[PDB]
Amino acid sequence: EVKPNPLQDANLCSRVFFWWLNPLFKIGHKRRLEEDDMYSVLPEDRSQHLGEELQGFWDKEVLRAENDAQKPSLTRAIIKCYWKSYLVLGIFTLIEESAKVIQPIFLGKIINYFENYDPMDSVALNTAYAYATVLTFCTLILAILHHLYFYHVQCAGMRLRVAMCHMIYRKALRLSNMAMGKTTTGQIVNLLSNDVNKFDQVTVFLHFLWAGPLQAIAVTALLWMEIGISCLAGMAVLIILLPLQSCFGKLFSSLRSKTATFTDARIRTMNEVITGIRIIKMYAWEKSFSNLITNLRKKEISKILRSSCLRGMNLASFFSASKIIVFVTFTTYVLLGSVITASRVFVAVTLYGAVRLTVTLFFPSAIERVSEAIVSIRRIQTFLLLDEISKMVHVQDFTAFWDKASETPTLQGLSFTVRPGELLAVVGPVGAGKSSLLSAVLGELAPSHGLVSVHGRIAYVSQQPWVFSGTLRSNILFGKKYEKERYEKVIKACALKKDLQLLEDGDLTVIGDRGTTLSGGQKARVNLARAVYQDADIYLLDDPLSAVDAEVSRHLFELCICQILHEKITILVTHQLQYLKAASQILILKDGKMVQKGTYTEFLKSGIDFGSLLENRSEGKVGFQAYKNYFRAGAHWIVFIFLILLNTAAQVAYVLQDWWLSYWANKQSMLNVTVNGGGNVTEKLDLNWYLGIYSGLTVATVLFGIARSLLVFYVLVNSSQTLHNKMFESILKAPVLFFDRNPIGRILNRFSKDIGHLDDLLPLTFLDFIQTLLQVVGVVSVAVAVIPWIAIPLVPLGIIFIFLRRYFLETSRDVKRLESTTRSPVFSHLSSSLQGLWTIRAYKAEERCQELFDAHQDLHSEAWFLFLTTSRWFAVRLDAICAMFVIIVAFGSLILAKTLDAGQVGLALSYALTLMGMFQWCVRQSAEVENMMISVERVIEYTDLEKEAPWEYQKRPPPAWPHEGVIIFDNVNFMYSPGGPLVLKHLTALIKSQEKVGIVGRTGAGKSSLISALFRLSEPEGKIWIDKILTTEIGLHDLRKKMSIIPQEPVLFTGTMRKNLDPFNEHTDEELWNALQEVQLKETIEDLPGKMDTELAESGSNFSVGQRQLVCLARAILRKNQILIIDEATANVDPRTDELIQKKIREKFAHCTVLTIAHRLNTIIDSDKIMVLDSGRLKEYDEPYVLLQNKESLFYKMVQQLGKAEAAALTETAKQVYFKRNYP
Ligand SMILES: CCCCC[C@H](O)/C=C\[C@H]1[C@H](O)CC(=O)[C@@H]1CCCCCCC(=O)O
C-alpha cells in the first residue's frame, strides 16, 4: 500500500470545497512534481474490476441478443451499466437548472424594490434584504454544484474510458489469424486514441441534451407571463440562428479542408526539399523552389483568409446576437404601446442572454459529442465482432489452408518424428512454408484436416524480436523464479559480458521499447535468452542470428545448442551449409510438399545441391519581446493604435447601449410617476427619437465589433505570413551546419506543429481572450461607475486572484507535462504487445500483459484525475471569488439605496451576475495563449538565425570564368566546427591541365572528410584557389555548381520534367532532345503520353536506380561542365548499367579535367595522378609509377587485401594504361 490516497477519510465539507489539495500544491509549488509524488486512484477506480464487469455486461447482452435472433448493441449495455450513476447526477442537473432559472426571478424582485422604495418602510427593506440573501445563497450553491457535477461527470467518463480501453485490449489479445491479418496496429492505435477519448467529453453534455429544452421552455413561459407576447420575435431569431450557424460551420469546415490539403502539399514539398537540401544548395535551384513555395503559400493563404473572415463574421454574430435580440424584443414591446419598467427589462435581457448562451454553446456541442460517441461506439462494436481464437511431435498429412479465398491446398506432406537429442534443420526458398509449420505446431493455424499431437509446454520464437517495457532481469526471466544455474548459463552462453561492461547497471536498468537504445544484435540476444530461459521440451526457432555477426553466432550456437538444448526437441530452420554439421535430420520443402525424410548423409549422397534453392522549453511566462515581434511583424504602430481604438470604441458602445437602456427605463418610470402623482397634463415621450437612438447605437456597436474582429484576424494572418516568409528566407540562406546538427524530424515538427497552431488555434483563441478581457473590464468599469466604493476591495481581491492563479499554474504545468509524458508509454506498450501476439498466444501468459496494461491505464487515469481535480479546485476558487465580489457589490448597493436608482442597481447586478464562468474562461484562454506562444517564440528564434556569406557580391564574374578549372592545394583543410576536431593537415599538390586526375580514399578513414573538403559546403580552413584566383568573393552557387553529384540519394524531383532537368530552361528544347537521345532516355518514357509534362512521384515509386543515374549524367552534360566527380557508385547499382555508364562517362568526358574520386581500386586505373591519403595527410601526388614501383607503400597492401585475382587484373590494367600513355 504505497502512495496512500487522500480524500478517502474526508468529510462532506472538505469534499465539496476541494480542501484536500493543500499538501500536493504545497509540494508542487516548492519543487518539481515527479511520478512518485502522485496520489493513487480510488478503490472503485481500478481498471480490473471495471473492465471485468463491463465485459460481463457485454457478453450477457450479446447472448441475450443472439438467443432471440437480433443484432447486439453496446450502447444498451453502457446504459444498463451506468444508469445508476447517470440518474443520480440528473437530479443535481435539474436542481441546478431550476436554480439558474429562478435566479433572474429573485433578481427582478430585488430590482423592483428600488422602484417603490420608501425610506420609512421597514417591510420593504426586510423583503429586499431577504431576497438579497436568497440570491447570494442560490448563487453560491450554483457555483458549488456546477463544479461538483462537472467533476463527477469527468470521473465517470474517465472510468468509462478506462473500462472500454480495457475491454478493447482484452478482445485484441484474443484475435485469430484472420482477425490479425484484417486489422493493422495503426487501426487499434487511432481507436484507443479517439473512441475512448470522446467518452470523457460526451458525458459532459449527455444530460444537457435534455436539460436544454426544459430550461428553454421554462424561461419562455416566464418571459411570457412577465412581459406578454413580445417574446415571439426573440424566439424566432433564436430559432433561425441555428441553421445560419450550421451553414456557417459547414462552409468553415469546407474551407478548413481546402487549406489543409494545400498545407499537406506544402509540408510534403518542404520535407522533400529539406531532406536533400544539399542537392538544391549545390545546383543553386533555390529560385524556382522559392517561386513554387510562395505560389503554394499564396494559394493556401487565400482560402485561409476566406476562412478567417468567415470565422470572424460568425464570432461577431455570436457576440451581437444578444444585443440584436434585446433590441428587436424591446422595439416590438414599445410598438405595442406599453410602459418600460427597469425590473422587467433587466429580467428580459438576463433571460435572453442566458437562453442565447445555452442554445449556442450546449446544444450544438451536445449534438456533435453525442454523434461522435455513437460513431465511436459503433466502430468499437464492429471491431469486437471479429473472429476470435479457439513429449514428441507426430503428424499425418495435416493439410490446412492459409488463403481461404483459393481453396487449393498451400502446403501438404506433414510426417515428422523426432527423438530426444536430435537437431533438425530446415531450408527453403521464399514462400516455402516454414511459417505455416511454425504456426501449425503452436496451434495458430486453424485445424481443417489432419492431426496435431504435441505434449508439454511449447514456446514460439518469431522471426522478428518482441519485448515489452520494464526492466531487463524480469524481462529475461519472464516473472519466474530467479534461479542461479539457469540464469548464469543463459547469461554466459549469450555473449552478454560485453553488453554488461558497456551497460549501466546490468539487468536492473529501465529499457524502453521501439529500439530507442538497443540495436538488432543485442535484441536478438535477449530474445533468444528469454526463449531458452524457460527450458521447455520442444523448441522451434526461426534464424535468431540474422542481425548478428557470423563467428559470434557460431560461438553462441556451440555454447547453447549442445549444452542446454542438447536434450531438448529442436527443429531449427537453417539458411545454407554453414549450419549442416551437427544436424541429424533435415527437411526440405518443395512447392508445398516433401519427398522423403532421412539423415543429412542420405540426402547428401543422393546428389542434392542447394545451389538451385539459393526540448528545453522556457519555464514560466514568455517574455514581452516575442509578443512585440509578433505584433510588429504584421502590423505597424499606427495599425496597433487603430485596432486598440476600435476595440475601445466597440466596448464603449456595448456599455452605452445598456446605459441608455437603463436611462430610458428611468425616464419612463419618472414620466409614469409624474403623470400618476397628481399630474393632469400628460407628456408622452417621443418614441421615434428613442427608437432611432437605440437602433443607431445597436448598428454602431455591431459594425464596431465586426470591424475590430476583421482587423484582428487580418493583422494576425499577416503576422503569421510574415513570420513564415522570414523563417523560409532565413533557413534557405542558412548553412548546412544547421541541417546537420538539427535532424530532419525536428525541422519537420517545427514546420508542421507551429504553423498549424499559428494558422488555426492562435487567432481564434487570441481574439476570444481579448473580447472576454474587454467584457470583464467593461463590467468592472460599470460597477465602479455605479458604486465608487467598489474600487476599495479591488486591490486585495486582485492580488489574491493573481497569487492564486500563479500558485495553480505552477502545479498545473508540471501536471500537464506528467500527463503528456505518461500517455504515450501506454500506446507504445499496446503497439509492442500487438506486434508479438504470436508469442503471447503461444506462451499462454496473457495475464502478465493484461496486468501491465492495467497498471499503465491506472497510472494514466491517476494523472488525468489529478489534472481534473486541480482544474476543478481552481474553478471552485475562481467562482467563489466571483460570488464574494457579487455579494459585496449587492450589499454595497442595497445599503446606499438612497443615492441609487432602480436602473443603476439593476444594471450593476446584471453585469455582476455575468462574471461567473466568464472569468474562468478568460483565465483559461490567457493560459492557452501563453502556452501556445512558445510556437511564436521558436518561429522568431528561427527567424533570427545567423546567415552565411551572401550568394553574389558586387563584383560580377566574367561570362568566361571559370575557363580552365585549375585548383591549387595550399594548406587547405575542412572544419566541422569552429575550434573543434581536425584530421586533415598540410595538403599540398599540383593538378594537371584538362586531363584525368584521381583522388583515392578508404572507408571510415577520410570518407566524410573528403566529401566535406572537396564539396566545400561550409567555410573551410585555409585559402582556396580556382585558377589561382581568390575564393572569398562569390558564394556557393556560381562556384560549386560545376560538380556532378553521385551520392546514395539519386535525382528526386516532383513535377514536370522541365523543372526536374532545368527549372529555368534558359536553352531551347533541341539540345535537351539531343542530350536525352544521347543518354538513351526517351525509349523508357515512350510508354506514357506525358513526354514533357508528366506527373512524377518522389522516393522512386516507379523509377529504378538505372534511369535515375542516366538522367543525372544527362543533366551533368547539359550543365556544360568542365569538372566531373564520381564516387561510391558501387552500392545500389546493377552491373550491366554500371559498366555501361562507366564506358559512356569514360569515352565522353575525355576533353577536360575530371576529378574522379577513387572509392574502389579498378576505376582509378584510368586516371593519371593519385595521392594516397592517410590520417589526413598525403605522401606523394604523381603518376601511379611511384606507387607501383615502391613496395612498402600501402597501395600494395590494399592490392593484396582486395584479392589475388583482382590484384592481377588491376596490375594488368595499370601496365596496359601506362603502355598506351607513354608510347602510343
Ligand atoms: C454563464 C455561463 C457559465 C459557464 C461559462 C461559459 O463558458 C461562458 C463563457 C463564454 C464566453 O463568454 C464566450 C465563450 O465561448 C464561453 C463559452 C465557451 C465554452 C464553454 C464550455 C466549455 C467548452 O466549450 O469546452
Side-chain angles (χ1 to χ4, degrees), residues 1203-1220:
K1204 186 46 212 173
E1206 182 166 340
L1210 64 92
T1211 179
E1212 176 46 33
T1213 309
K1215 291 168 314 202
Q1216 289 324 290
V1217 291
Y1218 209 86
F1219 289 158
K1220 318 311 162 274

PDB file of all heavy atoms in Angstrom, residues 1203-1220:
ATOM      1  N   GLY A1203      42.262  -9.214 -52.973  1.00  0.00           N
ATOM      2  CA  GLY A1203      42.189 -10.450 -53.729  1.00  0.00           C
ATOM      3  C   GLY A1203      43.332 -10.635 -54.705  1.00  0.00           C
ATOM      4  O   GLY A1203      43.808  -9.665 -55.301  1.00  0.00           O
ATOM      5  N   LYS A1204      43.781 -11.881 -54.878  1.00  0.00           N
ATOM      6  CA  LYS A1204      44.897 -12.149 -55.780  1.00  0.00           C
ATOM      7  C   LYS A1204      44.484 -11.991 -57.240  1.00  0.00           C
ATOM      8  O   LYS A1204      45.226 -11.415 -58.043  1.00  0.00           O
ATOM      9  CB  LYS A1204      45.450 -13.551 -55.527  1.00  0.00           C
ATOM     10  CG  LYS A1204      46.705 -13.884 -56.320  1.00  0.00           C
ATOM     11  CD  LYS A1204      47.712 -12.745 -56.271  1.00  0.00           C
ATOM     12  CE  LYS A1204      48.526 -12.674 -57.553  1.00  0.00           C
ATOM     13  NZ  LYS A1204      49.395 -11.466 -57.592  1.00  0.00           N
ATOM     14  N   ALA A1205      43.309 -12.510 -57.606  1.00  0.00           N
ATOM     15  CA  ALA A1205      42.829 -12.347 -58.974  1.00  0.00           C
ATOM     16  C   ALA A1205      42.563 -10.881 -59.289  1.00  0.00           C
ATOM     17  O   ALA A1205      42.922 -10.391 -60.367  1.00  0.00           O
ATOM     18  CB  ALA A1205      41.569 -13.185 -59.193  1.00  0.00           C
ATOM     19  N   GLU A1206      41.936 -10.164 -58.353  1.00  0.00           N
ATOM     20  CA  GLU A1206      41.749  -8.727 -58.526  1.00  0.00           C
ATOM     21  C   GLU A1206      43.090  -8.008 -58.586  1.00  0.00           C
ATOM     22  O   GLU A1206      43.245  -7.032 -59.327  1.00  0.00           O
ATOM     23  CB  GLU A1206      40.886  -8.172 -57.393  1.00  0.00           C
ATOM     24  CG  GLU A1206      40.596  -6.684 -57.500  1.00  0.00           C
ATOM     25  CD  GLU A1206      39.475  -6.242 -56.578  1.00  0.00           C
ATOM     26  OE1 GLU A1206      38.678  -7.104 -56.154  1.00  0.00           O
ATOM     27  OE2 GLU A1206      39.392  -5.033 -56.279  1.00  0.00           O
ATOM     28  N   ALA A1207      44.074  -8.485 -57.819  1.00  0.00           N
ATOM     29  CA  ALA A1207      45.414  -7.908 -57.873  1.00  0.00           C
ATOM     30  C   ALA A1207      46.010  -8.036 -59.269  1.00  0.00           C
ATOM     31  O   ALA A1207      46.521  -7.061 -59.834  1.00  0.00           O
ATOM     32  CB  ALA A1207      46.317  -8.587 -56.844  1.00  0.00           C
ATOM     33  N   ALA A1208      45.967  -9.248 -59.828  1.00  0.00           N
ATOM     34  CA  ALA A1208      46.484  -9.466 -61.175  1.00  0.00           C
ATOM     35  C   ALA A1208      45.737  -8.614 -62.192  1.00  0.00           C
ATOM     36  O   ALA A1208      46.353  -8.012 -63.078  1.00  0.00           O
ATOM     37  CB  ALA A1208      46.391 -10.947 -61.539  1.00  0.00           C
ATOM     38  N   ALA A1209      44.410  -8.539 -62.069  1.00  0.00           N
ATOM     39  CA  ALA A1209      43.624  -7.739 -63.002  1.00  0.00           C
ATOM     40  C   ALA A1209      44.022  -6.267 -62.940  1.00  0.00           C
ATOM     41  O   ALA A1209      44.202  -5.616 -63.976  1.00  0.00           O
ATOM     42  CB  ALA A1209      42.133  -7.909 -62.710  1.00  0.00           C
ATOM     43  N   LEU A1210      44.176  -5.728 -61.728  1.00  0.00           N
ATOM     44  CA  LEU A1210      44.465  -4.305 -61.602  1.00  0.00           C
ATOM     45  C   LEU A1210      45.880  -3.983 -62.065  1.00  0.00           C
ATOM     46  O   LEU A1210      46.100  -2.954 -62.712  1.00  0.00           O
ATOM     47  CB  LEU A1210      44.239  -3.824 -60.164  1.00  0.00           C
ATOM     48  CG  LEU A1210      45.082  -4.350 -59.000  1.00  0.00           C
ATOM     49  CD1 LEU A1210      46.287  -3.453 -58.767  1.00  0.00           C
ATOM     50  CD2 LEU A1210      44.238  -4.433 -57.738  1.00  0.00           C
ATOM     51  N   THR A1211      46.857  -4.849 -61.766  1.00  0.00           N
ATOM     52  CA  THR A1211      48.211  -4.564 -62.235  1.00  0.00           C
ATOM     53  C   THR A1211      48.310  -4.734 -63.747  1.00  0.00           C
ATOM     54  O   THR A1211      49.052  -4.000 -64.413  1.00  0.00           O
ATOM     55  CB  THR A1211      49.242  -5.441 -61.517  1.00  0.00           C
ATOM     56  OG1 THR A1211      50.551  -5.139 -62.016  1.00  0.00           O
ATOM     57  CG2 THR A1211      48.971  -6.914 -61.745  1.00  0.00           C
ATOM     58  N   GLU A1212      47.538  -5.667 -64.315  1.00  0.00           N
ATOM     59  CA  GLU A1212      47.484  -5.803 -65.765  1.00  0.00           C
ATOM     60  C   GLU A1212      46.903  -4.553 -66.411  1.00  0.00           C
ATOM     61  O   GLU A1212      47.474  -4.030 -67.376  1.00  0.00           O
ATOM     62  CB  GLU A1212      46.659  -7.041 -66.130  1.00  0.00           C
ATOM     63  CG  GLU A1212      46.426  -7.285 -67.619  1.00  0.00           C
ATOM     64  CD  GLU A1212      47.676  -7.129 -68.470  1.00  0.00           C
ATOM     65  OE1 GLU A1212      48.785  -7.444 -67.988  1.00  0.00           O
ATOM     66  OE2 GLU A1212      47.542  -6.703 -69.635  1.00  0.00           O
ATOM     67  N   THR A1213      45.785  -4.049 -65.879  1.00  0.00           N
ATOM     68  CA  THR A1213      45.191  -2.829 -66.416  1.00  0.00           C
ATOM     69  C   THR A1213      46.122  -1.633 -66.241  1.00  0.00           C
ATOM     70  O   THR A1213      46.183  -0.756 -67.108  1.00  0.00           O
ATOM     71  CB  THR A1213      43.841  -2.562 -65.749  1.00  0.00           C
ATOM     72  OG1 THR A1213      43.034  -3.744 -65.812  1.00  0.00           O
ATOM     73  CG2 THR A1213      43.111  -1.428 -66.455  1.00  0.00           C
ATOM     74  N   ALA A1214      46.858  -1.585 -65.126  1.00  0.00           N
ATOM     75  CA  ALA A1214      47.794  -0.490 -64.899  1.00  0.00           C
ATOM     76  C   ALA A1214      48.925  -0.511 -65.917  1.00  0.00           C
ATOM     77  O   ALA A1214      49.270   0.526 -66.496  1.00  0.00           O
ATOM     78  CB  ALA A1214      48.349  -0.559 -63.477  1.00  0.00           C
ATOM     79  N   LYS A1215      49.518  -1.685 -66.148  1.00  0.00           N
ATOM     80  CA  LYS A1215      50.560  -1.784 -67.165  1.00  0.00           C
ATOM     81  C   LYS A1215      50.011  -1.438 -68.544  1.00  0.00           C
ATOM     82  O   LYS A1215      50.689  -0.780 -69.342  1.00  0.00           O
ATOM     83  CB  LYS A1215      51.176  -3.183 -67.160  1.00  0.00           C
ATOM     84  CG  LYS A1215      52.000  -3.486 -65.916  1.00  0.00           C
ATOM     85  CD  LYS A1215      52.354  -4.961 -65.814  1.00  0.00           C
ATOM     86  CE  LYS A1215      51.154  -5.851 -66.089  1.00  0.00           C
ATOM     87  NZ  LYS A1215      51.332  -7.209 -65.505  1.00  0.00           N
ATOM     88  N   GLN A1216      48.769  -1.841 -68.830  1.00  0.00           N
ATOM     89  CA  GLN A1216      48.165  -1.520 -70.119  1.00  0.00           C
ATOM     90  C   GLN A1216      48.012  -0.015 -70.303  1.00  0.00           C
ATOM     91  O   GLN A1216      48.399   0.535 -71.342  1.00  0.00           O
ATOM     92  CB  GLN A1216      46.811  -2.216 -70.261  1.00  0.00           C
ATOM     93  CG  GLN A1216      46.899  -3.717 -70.442  1.00  0.00           C
ATOM     94  CD  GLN A1216      48.103  -4.137 -71.266  1.00  0.00           C
ATOM     95  OE1 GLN A1216      48.154  -3.902 -72.472  1.00  0.00           O
ATOM     96  NE2 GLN A1216      49.074  -4.765 -70.614  1.00  0.00           N
ATOM     97  N   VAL A1217      47.435   0.670 -69.314  1.00  0.00           N
ATOM     98  CA  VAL A1217      47.202   2.105 -69.467  1.00  0.00           C
ATOM     99  C   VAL A1217      48.527   2.855 -69.500  1.00  0.00           C
ATOM    100  O   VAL A1217      48.679   3.838 -70.234  1.00  0.00           O
ATOM    101  CB  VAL A1217      46.266   2.639 -68.365  1.00  0.00           C
ATOM    102  CG1 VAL A1217      44.852   2.105 -68.562  1.00  0.00           C
ATOM    103  CG2 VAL A1217      46.789   2.314 -66.980  1.00  0.00           C
ATOM    104  N   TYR A1218      49.522   2.381 -68.744  1.00  0.00           N
ATOM    105  CA  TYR A1218      50.839   3.005 -68.801  1.00  0.00           C
ATOM    106  C   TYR A1218      51.462   2.846 -70.183  1.00  0.00           C
ATOM    107  O   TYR A1218      52.059   3.790 -70.716  1.00  0.00           O
ATOM    108  CB  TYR A1218      51.750   2.413 -67.726  1.00  0.00           C
ATOM    109  CG  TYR A1218      52.810   3.370 -67.227  1.00  0.00           C
ATOM    110  CD1 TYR A1218      52.534   4.271 -66.207  1.00  0.00           C
ATOM    111  CD2 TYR A1218      54.085   3.373 -67.777  1.00  0.00           C
ATOM    112  CE1 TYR A1218      53.500   5.148 -65.748  1.00  0.00           C
ATOM    113  CE2 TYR A1218      55.057   4.246 -67.324  1.00  0.00           C
ATOM    114  CZ  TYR A1218      54.758   5.132 -66.310  1.00  0.00           C
ATOM    115  OH  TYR A1218      55.721   6.004 -65.856  1.00  0.00           O
ATOM    116  N   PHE A1219      51.316   1.662 -70.787  1.00  0.00           N
ATOM    117  CA  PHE A1219      51.895   1.426 -72.104  1.00  0.00           C
ATOM    118  C   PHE A1219      51.174   2.213 -73.191  1.00  0.00           C
ATOM    119  O   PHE A1219      51.809   2.658 -74.154  1.00  0.00           O
ATOM    120  CB  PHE A1219      51.881  -0.069 -72.423  1.00  0.00           C
ATOM    121  CG  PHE A1219      52.861  -0.871 -71.612  1.00  0.00           C
ATOM    122  CD1 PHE A1219      52.681  -2.233 -71.430  1.00  0.00           C
ATOM    123  CD2 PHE A1219      53.963  -0.262 -71.035  1.00  0.00           C
ATOM    124  CE1 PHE A1219      53.584  -2.971 -70.684  1.00  0.00           C
ATOM    125  CE2 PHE A1219      54.868  -0.994 -70.290  1.00  0.00           C
ATOM    126  CZ  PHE A1219      54.678  -2.350 -70.114  1.00  0.00           C
ATOM    127  N   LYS A1220      49.857   2.394 -73.066  1.00  0.00           N
ATOM    128  CA  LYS A1220      49.149   3.235 -74.027  1.00  0.00           C
ATOM    129  C   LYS A1220      49.368   4.722 -73.775  1.00  0.00           C
ATOM    130  O   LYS A1220      49.116   5.530 -74.677  1.00  0.00           O
ATOM    131  CB  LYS A1220      47.644   2.945 -74.026  1.00  0.00           C
ATOM    132  CG  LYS A1220      47.243   1.479 -73.958  1.00  0.00           C
ATOM    133  CD  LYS A1220      47.992   0.625 -74.970  1.00  0.00           C
ATOM    134  CE  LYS A1220      47.915  -0.850 -74.602  1.00  0.00           C
ATOM    135  NZ  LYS A1220      48.989  -1.250 -73.652  1.00  0.00           N
TER     136      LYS A1220
END
